[PDB]
Amino acid sequence: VETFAFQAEIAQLMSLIINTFYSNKEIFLRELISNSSDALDKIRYESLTDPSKLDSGKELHINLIPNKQDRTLTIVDTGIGMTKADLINNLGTIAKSGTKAFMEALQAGADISMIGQFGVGFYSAYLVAEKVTVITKHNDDEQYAWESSAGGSFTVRTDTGEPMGRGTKVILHLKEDQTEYLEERRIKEIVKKHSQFIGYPITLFVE
């Protein structure tokens, strides 16, 4: 297991998301589904010129998996996935500029719901989760697990769990008072409200 420090700006963003009083928490789901849709667009585009890029799985979809026993909500996609360099370097490099622009917009009067317009929508997961585990597999790299409970650090390890083929799985270890996001009617409501026109099948699993 390797432990990394978040850049000061991203740690500041995470503390802002965790500490700010903001009731409209449900937008986290739209942000994660939007990320999945973008990663699926990327592999679809690449497969147009190289069909072998789909040897790791032809199906392009998103699954929403609630688990009341584990108190987790998992967002699974079969998108392009992320390499180790994405998890350690590339996400952070992109997030620094996005965070700065988002911070400036917030001071000017914008609200947390607009986070996605700054390319840092993933961190809205901390509105509802105490810990987030991200399992990912890119065609050019091994399967990895990124994890953070915030507090200024994240970990990266090789994942020896069930191999996924290709894509990204975001596991939200929900806060005790945010279990409404495990309810079927609540998730259906949020998907219909914010993610009605996503160009990939969204399957909401039942418990």
Ligand X SMILES: Oc1cc(O)c(-c2ccnn2-c2ccccc2Cl)cc1CCc1ccccn1
Going by the annotation, the residues of the binding site for ATP are 35, 77, 96, 122
Please answer whether residues 103 and 62 qualify as being in contact, where contact means their C-beta atoms are separated by less than 8 angstroms. no
Window of 13-21, 28-36, 59-67, 101-109 that interacts with ligand X by CB under 6 A: 28-36
Binding to ligand X in span 160-189, by CB under 6 A: 168, 170
* Residue closer to ligand X, measured from CB, 109 or 123: 123
Window of 61-69, 76-84, 99-107, 183-191 that interacts with ligand X by CB under 6 A: 76-84
122 binds ligand X (CB under 6 A): yes
* Residue closer to ligand X, measured from CB, 91 or 128: 91
Window of 33-41, 100-108, 110-118, 172-180 that interacts with ligand X by CB under 6 A: 33-41
Task: Write down the residue that tokens 């279990």 correspond to.
Answer: 179
82 binds ligand X (CB under 6 A): yes
Task: Name the nearest CA neighbour of 149 among 134, 127, 132.
Answer: 132
146 binds ligand X (CB under 6 A): yes
76 binds ligand X (CB under 6 A): no
Instruction: Give how far Cα 56 sits from Cα of 46, 66, 67, 135, 163, Å.
Output: 13, 25, 27, 16, 11
Maximum Cα–Cα distance across the chain: 47
Window of 35-43, 55-63, 64-72, 194-202 that interacts with ligand X by CB under 6 A: 35-43
* Residue closer to ligand X, measured from CB, 71 or 123: 123
Residue 157 CB coordination number (10 Å):
12
Amino acid at the residue 200: Y
Shortest CB 38 distance to ligand X, Å? 4
Rounded distance between C-alpha atoms, residue 165 and residue 110, angstroms = 39
Question: Residues 83, 169, 6, CA angle at the centre, nearest 5°?
Answer: 60
Instruction: Give how far Cα 32 sits from Cα of 116, 195, 200, Å.
Output: 9, 10, 14
Q: Which residues contact ligand X by CB under 6 A?
A: 32, 35-36, 38-39, 77, 79-82, 91, 122, 134, 146, 168, 170
